[PDB]
Amino acid sequence: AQTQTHLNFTQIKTVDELNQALVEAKGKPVMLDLYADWCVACKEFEKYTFSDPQVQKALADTVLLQANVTANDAQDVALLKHLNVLGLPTILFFDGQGQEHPQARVTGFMDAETFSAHLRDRQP
């Protein structure tokens, strides 16, 4: 169509900005998407999974964060080490207390249906 509905992600660049966002999200679940222009699976996520109406509805009460590590500068490297991420794509989930749940990580592409199931069954 002429227009499209997208999830409104809050962009973060550093470990400190991530912490500030967690503090602000007290009591709410948080999802962090790690994206890079060279990561094909990441683009597929943005274009086909995060654009799905059912996926967007399932994330209605979740704080959405996103980090663009394309440049791969000092701050990007520091953020990835802090989170203990091996590669992209990687989507992390934090609970209302601000703690991550490693078992809920998504590390490969997932279509709208598979991702919706993950949220239903695995999101903290």
UniProtKB/Swiss-Prot annotation:
Subcellular location: Cell inner membrane
Domain Thioredoxin: 1-124
Disulfides per UniProt: 39-42
Residue spans, topological domain Periplasmic: 1-124
Function of the molecule: Required to facilitate the formation of correct disulfide bonds in some periplasmic proteins and for the assembly of the periplasmic c-type cytochromes. Acts by transferring electrons from cytoplasmic thioredoxin to the periplasm. This transfer involves a cascade of disulfide bond formation and reduction steps.
Family: Belongs to the thioredoxin family. DsbD subfamily.
Name used for this protein in its record: Thiol:disulfide interchange protein DsbD
Species whose genome carries this gene: Escherichia coli O157:H7
Covered residues, full protein: 442 to 565 of 565
